[PDB]
């Protein structure tokens with residue numbers, strides 16, 4: 001009973017047992033919940049998911065950038081086993097406990113910037129984003145929030161409002177929280193089709209956004225600008241150099257809280273501890289979740305002390321938040337990243353994947369763009385000889401990969417992005433094999 | 445190493461070690477997070493919380509109605525230990541797993557009503573409430589939601605909007621989600637000061653609410669009425685007999701989705717599986733969290749199939765939701781309730797507590813009202829010979845109980861309610877002792 005780090009197809013995909021389990025799902029779970037690949041998981045670790053039929057699939061999704069340090073990481077297993085025996089919940093607002101404080105300290109340490117910082121914990125990315133806005137409004141005593149045109153921030157009313165794409169995230173769920181405005185992001189590949197300078201010069205892309213913010217809202221009415229350092233669900237869009245620094249600067253000059261949403265990019269994923277570290281961005285607040293606790297429901301807001309302390313006592317909280325078992329897992333996750341060279345591992349994975357995809361792109365112009373950092377890499381698929389999105393090809397490729405025992409996700413505003421989010425504990429051999437399969441499907 | 449089911453004071457409260465840990469909390473955690481009793485927990489089970497100084501305190505809060513079946517319940521410990529080894533997270537929307545489906549099935553079974561039902565899982569009460577609204581709007585294609593004047597529903601933008609009390613829940617955090625309207629609830633004790641018939645006749649209290657809903661909103665503009673079967677944070681307010689049934693009926697006659705928020709009342713807490721069971725209320729949707737998984741972050745929306753299936757595919761979800769470890773805990777929690785007679789235990793606790801508090805009230809008219817069901821009981825404190833709230837006395841009593849090693853919570857719109865939320869696994873002796881201490885503090 002130890003999990004073999006090799007792909008294995010005993011059945012077609014999905015298999016007979018998964019198909020049986022699926023009858024139960026259809027009869028019990030709301031039809032609002034969509035499933036990408038309906039194989040039922042019995043076990044996972046390293047770079048492998050094992051299903052109910054005995055198949056072993058190559059994980060190139062890590063549950064959407066969550067099991068970065070690998071499913072059921074051994075330090076996490078240990079930390080959880082010990083904590084679950086001591087206590088499962090006290091509610092930190094009732095009687096506190098050291099595990100919550102320890103996590104706050106570690107986030108204060110590892111996040112960008114070097115001043116006084118404070119943290120608060122919740123259970124989901126959407127909750128943390130919600131609280132970053134509460135914090136910013138309490139501090140500034142201003143109303144509006146600016147989000148970007150490829151942004152994804154969550155499924156609650158306000159975070160739906162912050163999100164750009166109507167289907168499936170927003171359609172039919174409003175009316176939405178007021179005072180949300182939308183600005184254009186740095187999207188080099190498609191900016192390039194119109195203005196070559198904007199695509200390469202990030203400061204100029206920031207000016208484009210700032211001119212609109214100033215005209216349509218004004219700093220005097222603005223609490224916060226919120227941005228993903230790399231847009232996730234919107235299509236793994238890495239902004240031009242200079243873009244994030246220029247937003248930061250403008251926010252400082254204008255008493256607007258600058259918020260980095262690092263829910264997807266955070267915790268070693270991009271080849272640094274946080275995506276903001278690549279250009280030395282120091283946001284006023286940074287939002288984290290997903291990879292923070294190796295799959296346990298936990299999220300955080302971390303930021304400048306003066307800002308984070310603005311809400312009255314008892315103004316922030318929630319019953320479950322900073323659950324002590326989830327905290328034990330968070331501590332073991334941070335420990336794992338530092339002691340096992342995960343940031344460097346992310347950088348190895350970049351070199352391996354970029355090298356394959358760039359060689360593929362030279363051979364096949366259906367790859368409009370190859371972009372990303374660390375273990376967060378994507379290709380955008382287009383019709384040969386143009387820049388027109390090819391969603392059809394994107395879906396066919398993913399469906400073929402699934403059928404070949406490869407868990408690969410799509411994303412993108414136009415439905416034409418293949419994304420790669422392997423756990424860092426994937427072997428180079430499994431990672432290459434996953435890439436081989438993608439190349440074979442595209443070749444014929 | 446087994447936890448002694450007896451109160452013990454080795455130090456004053458809080459003790460020197462807790463006070464040391466508190467310096468760390470103040471330096472790391474946002475000042476927005478308030479703490480009721482700053483003792484740092486190292487262990488808990490049965491009816492006892494053990495702190496960092498070796499003190500053993502009587503738990504009369506269960507983390508705000510969360511550890512109903514006891515901290516670190518043995519079936520939960522077992523279920524969690526096994527699951528954490530298999531996998532920690534796949535994201536149900538990526539690749540599903542049986543644990544999530546199993547939980548959906550169990551909630552479909554144990555919730556009120558007998559038709560076709562479906563469930564969806566999230567991580568917090570606030571998230572589940574948010575999703576009940578999304579579901580209702582998708583189904584009805586109407587905008588407005590009605591909540592009540594003692595309501596508490598969560599700390600996100602929309603759930604803040606649904607919540608009645610500005611301090612500390614809402615102040616400075618808006619603007620809020622639009623189309624939330626407020627109606628008057630059945631509050632027998634204080635309704636009685638004005639109209640004796642309204643306080644006893646629930647159907648008449650429903651008419652009062654329905655007349656306002658009709659005048660200020662209209663059914664043709666209304667997606668949902670949402671209500672707590674017993675108002676929690678608002679002061680443990682049990683409505684008059686007939687109130688909930690009459691709302692249900694009106695909602696059916698008018699194509700408005702009726703939503704029971706059972707986040708606090710759910711899972712054996714009130715001497716039935718759900719608070720709605722006492723009058724046979726069958727809501728269209730019921731929202732659950734808190735006690736569902738013995739402290740693990742998990743929440744649910746369960747309801748009529750046709751309603752729950754209204755959102756398009758991928759319209760509902762979230763990354764962490766229905767975490768497999770939290771699900772293992774939920775299954776063990778339901779198993780624990782049924783196999784160990786917890787519902788009956790809740791009823792024993794009612795008889796014990798009501799008997800003490802009613803005898804206390806006959807002797808001491810500072811107890812304006814004694815109310816509640818099962819292990820959800822409260823007294824409302826007032827100035828002797830009137831019905832004027834006495835918040836001061838309420839705080840003094842709780843502070844004195846804390847100093848005597850009793851974890852007891854306050855609540856209420858007017859800050860004058862002592863509430864009792866012991867874990868069901870408290871012994872009668874510890875429960876009586878907790879009541880003895882309260883009686884002694886009030887006597888002199």
Ligand SMILES: [Cl-]
Nearest residue numbers: 007008009010
């Ligand atoms: Cl094979």
Ligand SMILES: [Cl-]
Nearest residue numbers: 188189192199
């Ligand atoms: Cl370019």
Ligand SMILES: [Cl-]
Nearest residue numbers: 093317318319
């Ligand atoms: Cl609260």
Ligand SMILES: [Cl-]
Nearest residue numbers: 347348350351
């Ligand atoms: Cl490199």
Ligand SMILES: [Cl-]
Nearest residue numbers: 451452453454
């Ligand atoms: Cl003692």
Ligand SMILES: [Cl-]
Nearest residue numbers: 632633636643
């Ligand atoms: Cl009465």
Ligand SMILES: [Cl-]
Nearest residue numbers: 537761762763
């Ligand atoms: Cl999502």
Ligand SMILES: [Cl-]
Nearest residue numbers: 791792794795
């Ligand atoms: Cl009884």
Ligand code: NA
Nearest residue numbers: 026027029031
């Ligand atoms: Na179905």
Ligand code: NA
Nearest residue numbers: 470471473475
């Ligand atoms: Na402080």
